[PDB]
Ligand binder design. Structure first.
Ligand SMILES: Cc1onc(-c2ccccc2Cl)c1C(=O)NCC(=O)O
Length: 358
C-alpha cells in the first residue's frame, strides 16, 4: 500500500485492537476506487488460525444493506413497490393494525414499533404469522423510527415473494453472483468452513444462532475482499452492468426519513458530508437497547446524494462490523472483527482514517 494509507490505517487500528482486546480484525480501505487490505490477529484462537483476506466474518446488521439492495432490485424489476400495503404480499395478515403499513415502513423501521427482535419462541411459519397478527403498534405508521430486525426482516421476506425464489436464492442470483461476491454466504458451505472465524463473547467462541428472519436481518457472512467489492459497488453503481441491480443500489441510498442529522435508506443510513464526526460517532452508540425517535418524511425521497457519509454498523454476539463510504470522494472503509466492541470506537476509527485520506 501507499505509505500514507499504511500509516493512517496502522496508527488507528493497532491501538483500537489493544484497547478493545479484539482477537482478529480485517480492514479494507477503498482509495480512489482501489482496495487496500490489512489483517491482524486470529480467526480461531484455539487452533491458531490467523485472519486472512479469505477469512469469513459474521456481518450482523450490515446484512441489512444486502437486504435493502435486494429489495431495491425487486422494485427496479417491477416485482414490488414500496408504496404497496404489506397485506398485498401477505394476505393472511388480516389484523386491522396492518391497514396503512406499507413495504416502505417495514424497510425503514417506521411501521409503528415493531420490536428489535423476533421472539426466540417464534420458530415455525405459523408462529411468525401469529406474531405479526398479534403485534400492537405503539404509533401510527410513518411517525417514529425504531430500529428492528422484525421490520426489515419481514420486508426482505416479502420482497422476494413475487419472484418465487427463496430469500437466499434471490440474494445469490440477483446480488452476490452479479457482483462477483463469491465468498459471501447466508449459509456457510462445508467447503468454506476452514475460513469461518469464530466470534468471541466473554472469551467464548461463538457463532450466530438460527432464528426467524435471520437471513434477512443479520445472516450474511463475508470476507474482507468481498466486502471491499460491496463497497466499490455501492460507491459506483453505474459501473454495474445489471440494470435492475444498478437501480436497486441507488434506491437503497435514497433518503426516505430524517431523524436529527441522519437519513434512513434501505439498510444504509446516511448523513450529509462533511459530517460532524461527533454526530456520527455518538449517533452510532446503540443508545441503548431501544431508541424510539420521531421521523420526518422526505416527500418524495431524495435520490442518492453523492456528498454523503453512507454507513452501517453490524453486530452478532461474537462479531462487530462497520462499513462507511463517501461517494463524492470515491473513498470507503470496511472493518470486520470477531468481537462485538462498542460502535463509537468503530465510527471514531473509521472517521480518523477516512478524514486523513480525504
Ligand atoms: C444491533 C443489532 O441488530 N441486530 C442484532 C442482532 C444480531 C444477531 C442476533 C440478534 C440480534 Cl438482536 C443486533 C445486536 O446487538 N446483536 C448482538 C447479539 O446478538 O448479541
Amino acid at each position: 500500500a501507499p505509505q500514507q494509507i499504511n500509516d493512517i490505517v496502522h496508527r488507528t487500528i493497532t491501538p483500537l485492537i489493544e484497547q478493545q482486546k479484539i482477537p482478529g480484525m480485517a480492514v479494507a480501505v477503498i482509495y480512489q476506487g482501489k482496495p487496500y487490505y490489512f489483517t491482524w490477529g486470529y480467526a480461531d484462537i484455539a487452533k491458531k488460525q490467523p485472519v486472512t483476506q479469505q477469512t469469513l466474518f459474521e456481518l450482523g446488521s450490515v446484512s441489512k444493506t444486502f437486504t435493502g439492495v435486494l429489495g431495491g432490485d425487486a422494485i427496479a424489476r417491477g416485482e414490488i413497490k414500496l408504496s404497496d400495503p404489506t397485506t398485498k404480499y401477505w394476505p393472511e395478515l388480516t389484523a386491522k393494525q396492518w391497514n396503512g403499513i406499507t413495504l416502505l415502513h417495514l424497510a425503514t423501521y417506521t411501521a409503528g414499533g415493531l420490536p428489535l427482535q423476533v421472539p426466540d419462541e417464534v420458530k415455525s411459519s405459523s408462529d411468525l404469522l401469529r406474531f405479526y397478527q398479534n403485534w400492537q403498534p405503539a404509533w401510527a405508521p410513518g411517525t417514529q423510527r425504531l430500529y428492528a430486525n422484525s421490520s426489515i426482516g419481514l420486508f426482505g421476506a416479502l420482497a422476494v415473494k413475487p419472484s418465487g425464489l427463496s430469500f437466499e436464492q434471490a440474494m445469490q442470483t440477483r446480488v452476490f453472483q452479479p457482483l462477483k461476491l463469491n465468498h459471501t454466504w447466508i449459509n456457510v458451505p462445508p467447503a468454506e468452513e476452514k475460513n469461518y472465524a469464530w466470534g468471541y463473547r466473554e472469551g467464548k467462541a461463538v457463532h450466530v444462532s438460527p432464528g426467524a428472519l435471520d437471513a434477512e436481518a443479520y445472516g450474511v457472512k463475508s470476507t474482507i475482499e468481498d466486502m471491499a467489492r460491496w463497497v466499490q459497488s455501492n460507491l459506483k453503481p453505474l459501473d454495474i452492468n445489471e440494470k435492475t441491480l444498478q437501480q436497486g443500489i441507488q434506491l437503497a441510498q435514497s433518503r426516505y426519513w430524517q431523524t436529527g442529522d441522519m437519513y434512513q435508506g434501505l439498510g444504509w443510513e446516511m448523513l450529509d458530508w462533511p459530517v460532524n464526526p461527533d454526530s456520527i460517532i455518538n449517533g452510532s452508540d446503540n443508545k441503548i437497547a431501544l431508541a424510539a425517535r420521531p421521523v420526518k418524511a422526505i416527500t418524495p425521497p431524495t435520490p442518492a446524494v453523492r456528498a454523503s457519509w453512507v454507513h452501517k454498523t453490524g453486530a452478532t454476539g461474537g462479531f462487530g462490523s462497520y462499513v462507511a463510504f463517501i461517494p463524492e470522494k470515491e473513498l470507503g472503509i470496511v472493518m470486520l472483527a470477531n468481537k462485538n466492541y462498542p460502535n463509537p470506537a468503530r465510527v471514531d476509527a473509521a472517521w480518523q482514517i477516512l478524514n486523513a485520506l480525504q
